[PDB]
Nucleic acid binder design. Structure first.
Length: 371
RNA sequence: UGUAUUUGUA
């Protein structure tokens, strides 16, 4: 009110910074073209010893963020030089996370990025602390910002934290961690995906029927570059428990996605008469083996609250109609799937009670109409 | 008959 009458040279910037209306006033001044540079430079010299304090402040964080839109490269580098050792403390802070996201979002150069990355390194931030950040209500937004803003060549501290011991569990089975991990996997390098997948496969039993972990397995199954090993690797680890996994709430979805993936690979090959040959040969043997397992365990699966979905997915002629040495396979498939259909039809009166009997009957009928 | 989305910081 009378503050606006004073010359900028005489303002008490640190006091204004932590005050709501003082802070709004400074932001307006930064948005004032005639005075922007001068208020920026004057403010900067007075508030620089308090960079960390302001970043964490309920009102100061708004000033710091605004400042990011106006700071010179020199000014921003000095700011980052001041606070990089404190990135953990900042990231878990409800105000700090907003400040740091903005800072990352407006980096000028590689020097600034490397300083930030240095702060997240083990010199200043422990692996345990990085895991905490990944799962933290506030911190996970900072990790995600790094993931989308920085080159994957900088992802070292994140990869290291994930693959350490059993941290893959701690992260994949967490509400926030599961989402962060998917973001990471969508942009990181193939070799970085491999290192994480090794750990995911190693701890598969603690992931496959987890409420969040199951989404991670499914995410891997959508990465085509993993086909050459992931299919066989997953099936080798799980084949003996395939029926039980099919009958559980969360893992049943993983089974369905796995089966649909097998169908899509094999049919895509046949349409072209596209995945590599070895991916295709592997898929054929697993599908046939899967049909055998579902055939043996048909009585449990058709009756189970979750298993019936996996069964229906395997039975759906929409998934495999082109399938009705590709010559020998297509012949073996038609035989095994036809046998499963007739066994299913025989069982229909035994599940008359269930609400999904008609759906299974329709699929049986659809098979007949196609053959 | 079947699963996740955090942030409306003044």
């Amino acid at each position: 009110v009378e503050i606006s009458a004073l010359p900028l040279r005489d303002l008490d910037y640190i006091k204004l910074a932590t005050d709501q209306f003082g802070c709004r006033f400074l932001q307006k001044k930064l948005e004032t073209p005639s005075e922007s540079n001068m208020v920026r430079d004057l403010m900067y010299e007075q508030i620089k010893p308090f960079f960390l304090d302001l970043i964490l402040d309920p009102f100061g964080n708004y000033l710091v963020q605004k400042l990011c839109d106006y700071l010179t490269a020199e000014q921003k580098t000095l700011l980052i030089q001041t606070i990089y050792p404190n990135v953990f403390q900042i990231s878990i802070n409800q105000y700090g996370t907003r400040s740091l996201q903005k800072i990352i979002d407006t980096v000028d150069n590689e020097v600034q990025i490397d300083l930030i990355i240095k702060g997240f390194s083990q010199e200043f931030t422990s692996i345990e602390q990085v895991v905490t950040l990944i799962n933290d209500l506030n911190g996970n937004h900072v990790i995600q910002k790094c993931i989308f803003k920085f080159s994957p060549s900088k992802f070292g501290f994140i990869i290291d934290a994930i693959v350490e011991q059993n941290n893959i569990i701690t992260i994949s089975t967490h509400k926030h961690g599961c989402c962060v991990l998917q973001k990471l996997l969508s942009v990181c390098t193939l070799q970085q995906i491999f290192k994480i997948s090794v750990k995911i496969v190693q701890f598969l039993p603690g992931l496959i029927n987890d409420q969040f972990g199951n989404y991670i397995i499914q995410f891997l199954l959508d990465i085509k570059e993993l086909d050459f090993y992931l299919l066989a690797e997953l099936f080798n680890r799980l084949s003996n428990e395939l029926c039980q996994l099919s009958c559980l709430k969360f893992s049943s979805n993983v089974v369905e996605k796995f089966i649909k993936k097998l169908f899509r690979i094999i049919t895509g090959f046949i349409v072209n008469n596209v995945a590599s040959d070895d991916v295709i040969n592997a898929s054929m043997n697993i599908l046939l083996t899967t049909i055998d397992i579902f055939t043996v365990n048909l009585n449990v699966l058709i009756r189970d609250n979750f298993g019936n979905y996996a069964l229906q997915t395997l039975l759906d002629v929409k998934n495999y109609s082109p399938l009705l040495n590709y010559g020998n396979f297509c012949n073996d498939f038609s035989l095994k799937i036809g046998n499963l259909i007739v066994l299913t039809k025989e069982l229909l009166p035994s599940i008359k009670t269930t609400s999904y009997a008609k759906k299974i009957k329709l699929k049986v009928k659809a098979y007949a109409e196609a053959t």
